[PDB]
Amino acid sequence: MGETLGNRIRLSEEIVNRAASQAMRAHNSAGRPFLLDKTRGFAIFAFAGSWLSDDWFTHPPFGETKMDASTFPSLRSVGNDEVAVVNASFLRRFKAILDQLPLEREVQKVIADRRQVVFTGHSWGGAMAILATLYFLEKAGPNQNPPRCITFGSPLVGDRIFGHAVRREKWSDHFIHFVMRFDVIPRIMLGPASTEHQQILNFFNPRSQFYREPLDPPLGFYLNVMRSASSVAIHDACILMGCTNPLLETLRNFTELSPYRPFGTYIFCTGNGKLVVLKNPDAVLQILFYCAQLSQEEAAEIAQRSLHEHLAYENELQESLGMQNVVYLDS
Template sequence: MAGGTRVADIIGMRDDQVINKACSFAMKDHKPPAKPYILEKSRGSPDTYFFIFPGSWLVSDWFAQKPFGETKINRPDNPPKFPSLRSIGNDEVATVNDAFLRRFEEKILGASDFKEKVQKAETDKKQIVFTGHSLGGSMAILATLWFLDNCKFDKTSPPLCVTFGSPLTGNRIFSHALRREKWAPYFIHFVMRYDIVPRLLLAPIPSIEKEFESILRFFATKSVNKPEEAPDFYRTVMTNAASVASHAACNLMANPNLLLETVTNFTALSPYKPFGTYFFCTGNGKPVVLRNSDAVLQLLFYSSQLNSEAELHEIARTSLDQHFGYENELKKMQDVVDLKKLETLSYSAEATGSDSATINSALNDLGLSTRARLCLLAAVEFEKRKQRNMDSIDTKKIQKEITELESYRVICKTRLMSCYDAFRLHNSPHDFKANVNRLELASIWDEIIEMLKRYQLPDDFEGQKDWVELGKRFRRLVEPLDVANYYRHSKDEESGPYLGTPGKPRKPRPKRYIYTQRWLEHAQKLPAESSGESHFWAEVEELRTKTSSPDGFEQVKPRVLQLERNIQKWVNGEELGKDKDVLLCQESILVKWWKTLPDQHKKDSAFNNLIY
């Protein structure tokens, strides 16, 4: 590769040889029974280790259950192997192709020395490149994700995942989570214009299963004669790709048409979505680069459309040949057309101006129509709209209301009361003003949560340090007041305990606290539900009720002991603020309740030493 913007410039590598070598290794004919992975130490790049994953031409390695073969990436009966692959607040776990996941878990993680070799390479400070062609690309993706989530690595030399003709592997949560963790730049995917494999999982398994067996046999033998099923296979895949792309485009454009919802009720759409950086190979040595996953989905469809029905047989054959054309394509690559400034794109195929003309020429090479260009622009606008939503949040008002409540906490301390005890009694004008602050903040944060539930904020929002910190301050300061208000008005008698009842899905606890607690736990890699310092008062209130009966204490003794341990930990760590003298004073609701517990328990409890 020479001249202009190089592939290495896009991905931050010193030279393009790493990509060329990854392609050469990935495209080797790994005939069965192939090893689960191959480790190559390149002579020209001694500091780079290539972990290469061979593909498979067995249908069972591609498809599991129907219609799309997806499953949650973290098995419910095991510790999560990919804890970051979820949306944090919504707690929505990413889904992945089940056959791919099983192959990775059983043949790579479970039956080889893969973990040891990868960890040694990182310890030896080698540049690690995970790579694969076809299904091997999906194995490389899962290997990279496992590494990022389970191994310590130098962020100045992160791992790189390079795939060639890889099928789509996971759903939209993949892209969401990788952008939040700032891992998306580590994933580089090369796709030939007509290669059918990166598109095939956009079709339901039953619609292509029979033809796909013939396609895989062709791939395995690399026969000169194309399977007669190729045209029907191509048509079926692209018809379903059209449905997925059209539905996604309507959502990007905020189309209010209720017909969209009706259609999805009757027609199952593929859950698979792209993520990372895509290089679309045009065939003329000038690949087009896209990082916007919504735009990539549109390009996967529109770049491989037929101009006429007469092209079907020829394009169908080309779609199979191009699956093995990556090495030759990389050899002739020159300038790279980076669509980072996609907003400069013109609707017309006759654009002028240096930047616009370059982009326009590249998109013409991909055969993009006016409609296709509109869909790409819609993807760009969708990202801008999410950024505008975040910018519209009144952070100054949040800070102002929080500052006033912090002043309220100081006032309560001068009254020799914790803010929880004072707000529970609610007999001072200061308490009334604090309630106004509480309601103002609740309104703002509820709007934020609603936008998060609909994925209308930037993907990295929940991972931004400023928002994690602001959410922590908000939760620790305001939730005790919410709990006090809940029990002051005896809402537990109608709606049950604030923290909910085991076995019942509904919990009165507002999502504005659940989400912000999850942000902190994720950022600090804490166990789920471990940072309950903002709502421990709800546990106190419930235990007060349960221990009021003669035999009540014995029934909840483990919970009492756990609460005591937690409070001691939170007091020592100052998670409960610096006013522990009023929190644990003799007139505190907490202390008054604790004194009602059996004498032997109080005598043996370390909590006794905390009370003033």
Template structure:
């Protein structure tokens, strides 16, 4: 029945990152490498801790009047959050149809795309619940014992946000802490793809483990907009709370609710699959402009329970999204009512799963998704058995393989950029040794020499500038499309080389900008002319170093140029505040600017000498200017 809700890609010849025939030939041998393991080996969590977390999550439901419960074991403090059965606790009607809002950048400064400086979106209702208990939560987190946050149902999102908040606190602390763990059961989705991207970049995703039974409707609810769910949402939540169908069985409420959720889940999963497969059909963009899809995305490690003593472990968020849809896809219309009712009952099946001996569960890790077979027929391995028990069709397997291949393509893109990193380093070394240092010997800084363009070496420096710009612009475009691994912007080697590139080459871009008077047509460099390659690399450093003030060393020349322009038509008194601010910045970054700005013939010094005597005599950089002048005189007399 639900096959009719599955969006068919308009172009049958999609670019898929897999070679189907070759993959089929080697599928049998590759599958043998994906052996099953114990749950502890797959998640890094002891089975006893998982059981304790479930017990705490259930206990929290019985004390819903309290913001959370605190239980202590020998090794951990377990903080559990109760669910809520009011629609207002799941969706905020005052926000968009999916109830999302921008995350609080003060509480969660890391949950963003660094280069784009775009913060994640989270469910507003869940976020408000977290904010309401944060004050009390701070009071119990002063002990040094490792913390586990847990929650079932709507308690899961609060546990997730509490975990991220504590990880943020630990990131900003100089003390070594054991990172908190988060274990959820049947949790709804919380944030969008930037949420997932940021947690993986910060290496925080590994601390989150989400348990999901095959048919549980709750992890899928937020794939549908509130207006489509509103007629039956309270009835469904009441049934979930009472652990019985109750009024949800009257008038096929459960069936209608299930169909609504899965119809939207189909659209989300199909759109995601088209993206993974590289579909460029413009019809998709046209459809998205009329029909808004759910922004929510999975993250962390997902543990899917099968009907037997197996669990399927998935860490790829794109693959998790596909499983959330395909595991509930119906094979015939006659199944609809039964599966709809089962989707409500499954929300409490974790209890029976936790009563089992968790040590006997076989954990099947789906690490090499691009090596999955395209059909499960006639195959009898632990993996194929588990995937069969999740009800995954051939189309589901194709989408899972595309998810794996898409991730592999990101890694290949990074490898390609790593090769170009050698070219970047060569160009940086040549510019430093053959241009910047030579210009300083000539008595004129490389900024002013480049701006004048009187020597062949200036022309060669411009060629190197353009070569570097091409490489870095390619990296920026891939980052904008999220075509590099999520961890890329947090890697020390790229942060270091990006900072070196910015500090060395941006002054040349500024010189070129004002040499050609682009400011007359476009406006100030910092507002209209600054390329993204410098904005991105600056944000990388500031985030990595937890800087409270911007790293402005590479843009000081732009401020000099703008002040030179202003003081031609304005009195000193009108510009004094900006001039003092510039000098303070220069003082702060003096060791980083290689003293080029303080050379006697520099653009800055020629302008600075025109400032009133009373200003120059009291300037915070006066001593540095005098020291540089003495050094320059001594060098010239040798």
């Protein structure tokens, strides 16, 4: 009733909180890639994250490949246009879930059971949730309600063409991505694979919280991530102002920039229980850097702070959704 976020995104606050809880429970669950949670009128498929570097980068610097035109036909480029680009490890792992597990049959079963389908994931798990949603959008029958995707601190998945295709097919609003202010994982794929990416993953792996000795984060990982985020944001700003790709390559001395870009509806948790909702992908890229800038020193502080925020989506949304202070930028 009244003006709530749940009305704007057409997902109740109860199910978003449920999705956050299931997403954290899915991690490190006896090797299983997903769990299914059934509640009245809903089926939540929550995908476990992976903290193996090979599951993030098939090859450095960006681990990208062509989006599978057979599996996702609607995301194809018209004619000989540049093809949509996806993280190769993400796609490989999602395809393995489909091939090895009866995911599609279980999705058809809950739909036939009159349940709304929600794919959800935290961290790497959000990439599986994103690919699952696109796959079942591709194969849906005519009178099936569209699946929804909710991610928490998820990495980026696709490039600009990928995102443009999702928007073109009118699928972008089905995706809701929560991003904490200082969570680096939504930003980390804007930079090349760090030589210490595995050590970054170990630090952000929830199982590391139970270790007797605390794992140390690699020195300067946060600002190294934010330098790349600003590089990609300012690159796209130059493109939108008329600069050409060859010229920009000369200006930056021909270094490689990340191809990945945000898509879908983003919800930034900006602190003091405030939420900022926006859909424009160009604005999301700018704000991924803009809201994550640091004050004071935060040299020996941001590491623990970024980890806490990456792991605190449950508590943050319990508070921010129960007592709402939400602003919409393109609504």
